[PDB]
Amino acid sequence: PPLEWPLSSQSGSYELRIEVQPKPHHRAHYETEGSRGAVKAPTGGHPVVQLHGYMENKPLGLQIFIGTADERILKPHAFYQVHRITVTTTSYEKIVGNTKVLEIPLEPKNNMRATIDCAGILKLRNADIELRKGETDIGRKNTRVRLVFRVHIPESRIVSLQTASNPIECSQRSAHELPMVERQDILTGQNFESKVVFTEWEMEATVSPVKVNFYVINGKRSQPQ
DNA sequence: TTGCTGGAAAAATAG
DNA sequence: AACTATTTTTCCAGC
């Protein structure tokens, strides 16, 4: 079942859930550089993923890849690949289509719970990707990703679950300069002479049914909401 | 050695 | 063909 297919995070009594979410900022590294580390959690630990409602005593693979955080439907990000780090967990890398995918064991003895400390992020160069035949996606200014996890549970048929993380900003500059919105309804985020502006219409909100968006502004705007 | 950075200069590029 | 403010890629330095 291709990565480009959408899947539920649950089916029947099975549910794949992100227990601890990644930080909102992880600076990716290039091939012309050293590793810039595993994706960290705000704890100072690491993302945690759990599968619920698996009763059997045989372990499963958890697959990890880097997807989009865009308005369109979710897909492998053309310009970022997961990076194996070699760390508590054993892991290995396979290719699936044009996409690199990392696989971690998910074990009954740990309640199908895993700490993700062995996945960093590699930034590919826009020029290189945009040349590949069949590719029309645009790198420039597309530096937000999500960790995507999927799992394959066999019966007698295969139930295939996917959960994607909150967006991560992988750009050094955007992390220094931009406000980032994590949660709403009280706004929490990062790098908050701040203003908040609603549009459709344009109207500053005062502060430290219809379809309509807001943005937090510094300069240097967050994404629309 | 490699891993893992922070910080920033060089290079690229959109319009 | 050339420019410039903005964005990406390489580079330096320090454990």
Side-chain angles (χ1 to χ4, degrees), chain A residues 1-22 24-39 41-42 44-55 59-70 74-93 95-132 134-156 158 160-162 164-182 184-194 196-199 201 203-205 207 209-212 214 216-220 222-225:
Chain A
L3 278 61
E4 295 82 18
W5 267 347
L7 301 167
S8 173
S9 83
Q10 52 168 337
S11 168
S13 52
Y14 303 128
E15 157 148 10
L16 181 69
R17 154 184 159 76
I18 296 172
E19 206 81 19
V20 178
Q21 286 271 175
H25 298 344
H26 182 269
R27 182 184 168 174
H29 63 265
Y30 291 73
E31 299 145 293
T32 60
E33 232 185 9
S35 156
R36 283 161 181 296
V39 173
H46 290 288
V48 171
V49 167
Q50 209 192 56
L51 171 68
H52 305 281
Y54 179 72
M55 313 304 185
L60 301 176
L62 181 62
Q63 296 186 317
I64 317 179
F65 70 89
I66 308 298
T68 51
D70 69 10
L74 185 77
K75 49 155 62 217
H77 202 308
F79 299 94
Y80 293 92
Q81 298 300 302
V82 67
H83 178 246
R84 176 157 186 266
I85 302 188
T86 190
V87 162
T88 215
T89 338
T90 78
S91 71
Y92 78 84
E93 38 182 20
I95 268 66
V96 179
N98 299 286
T99 299
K100 174 96 76 62
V101 173
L102 180 64
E103 192 166 309
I104 263 59
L106 212 55
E107 275 176 340
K109 53 165 212 165
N110 302 305
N111 281 309
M112 308 308 283
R113 182 194 211 66
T115 287
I116 315 301
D117 59 349
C118 62
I121 300 182
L122 172 72
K123 168 58 163 67
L124 297 161
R125 292 201 305 238
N126 314 137
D128 299 339
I129 297 292
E130 285 162 357
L131 259 46
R132 220 200 315 118
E135 250 288 304
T136 60
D137 265 302
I138 332 177
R140 184 189 143 76
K141 305 189 85 144
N142 278 107
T143 63
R144 284 158 38 73
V145 305
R146 304 161 181 174
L147 289 185
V148 189
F149 305 86
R150 70 154 67 158
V151 73
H152 298 293
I153 312 165
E155 302 165 340
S156 284
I158 307 159
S160 300
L161 307 185
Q162 177 156 290
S165 79
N166 304 142
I168 309 165
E169 176 61 69
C170 291
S171 153
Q172 184 201 2
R173 205 175 89 110
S174 304
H176 198 235
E177 286 194 352
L178 294 197
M180 172 154 212
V181 180
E182 310 175 48
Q184 323 175 201
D185 267 301
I186 313 173
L187 269 53
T188 60
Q190 230 131 294
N191 289 12
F192 296 151
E193 15 227 324
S194 272
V196 169
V197 180
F198 287 68
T199 58
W201 185 47
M203 189 59 57
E204 185 198 288
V207 300
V210 194
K211 206 154 192 187
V212 108
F214 55 104
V216 183
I217 319 198
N218 285 238
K220 295 176 188 164
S222 93
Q223 355 79 244
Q225 314 284 149

